[PDB]
């Protein structure tokens, strides 16, 4: 049982609006548990899972203050970036950040993350060593040297190995049956008429969590990259996910076709047919 935490943060400026909007969302094991939004009437971190209500008022106040700090940070960085790319006034601009930690099943730190994007594109990221920086862009090199000069990495590294890990542990305790759980996929195959002498077989997987899943079709062993049709995994909107894969099959040589569903929540992969 591995775990993770992330914060996803965004500042967005728009031609007219006077100062940026800043949003931060926290996840535990890929599920949103906290959120902050400067557009709100009274901007504060808010719980986004029941088990976060446990946290007392000081937690919220202090996180709230840190958010206001992040907002100011993004605001200045946006203004700096505008200059590094020689962008004029009059456009919209975006700065995003992903941060957090992965733990193994033993709850020890597997890996820290710290990554930034500007206009939706990789700007600078902290390497896995939590010591050196990747920055592709010529403009991005000004930041890399600035952050190398200031020993930024050691500080992020301390956050990732320490506070990030320590608070995730606490969260994992505070919500133990809300994260410990997966829902297995319920799968069925539907039948649709088609061109003369041909039918579309649609293998559905429903009601699963987490979202990662794999669907395949076999003509008795042989998988099919051959114009097999699918849809991107999508939310039911109730916290599970949906996905289907379909294929075209000679009407009445249809029984020769089996679907398989791969998902973590499964005792083992499913095999399904009309």
């Amino acid at each position: 049982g591995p775990h993770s935490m992330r914060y996803f943060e965004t500042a967005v400026s728009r031609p007219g609006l006077e100062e940026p909007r800043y949003i931060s969302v926290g996840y535990v094991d890929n599920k949103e548990f906290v959120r902050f939004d400067s557009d709100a009437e009274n901007p504060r971190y808010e719980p986004r899972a029941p088990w976060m209500e446990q946290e007392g008022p000081e937690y919220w106040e202090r996180e709230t203050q840190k958010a206001k700090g992040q907002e100011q940070w993004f605001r200045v960085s946006l203004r700096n970036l505008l200059g590094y790319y020689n962008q004029s006034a009059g456009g919209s601009h975006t700065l995003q950040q992903m941060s957090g930690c992965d733990l193994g099943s033993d709850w020890r730190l597997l890996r820290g993350y710290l990554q930034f994007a500007y206009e939706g594109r990789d700007y600078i990221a902290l390497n896995e060593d939590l010591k050196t920086w990747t920055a592709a862009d010529m403009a991005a090199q000004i930041t890399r040297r600035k952050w190398e000069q200031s020993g930024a990495a050691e500080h992020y590294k301390a956050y990732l190995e320490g506070e990030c890990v320590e608070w995730l542990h606490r969260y994992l305790k505070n919500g133990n049956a809300t994260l410990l759980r997966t829902d297995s996929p319920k799968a069925h195959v539907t039948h649709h008429p088609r061109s003369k002498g041909e039918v579309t077989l649609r293998c559905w997987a429903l009601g699963f969590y987490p979202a990662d899943i794999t669907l395949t079709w076999q003509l008795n062993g042989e998988e099919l990259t051959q114009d097999m049709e699918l849809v991107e995994t999508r939310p039911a909107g109730d916290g599970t996910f949906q996905k289907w894969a379909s294929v075209v099959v000679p009407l009445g040589k249809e029984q020769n076709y089996t679907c398989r569903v791969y998902h973590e929540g499964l005792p083992e992969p499913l095999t399904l047919r009309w």
Binding site: E63, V76, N80, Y84, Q97, T143, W147, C164, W167
Partner: peptide, 9 residues
């Protein structure tokens, strides 16, 4: 709990 960032960009 999230990062509190250091040197600006």
């Amino acid at each position: 709990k999230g990062p509190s960032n250091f040197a600006t960009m």
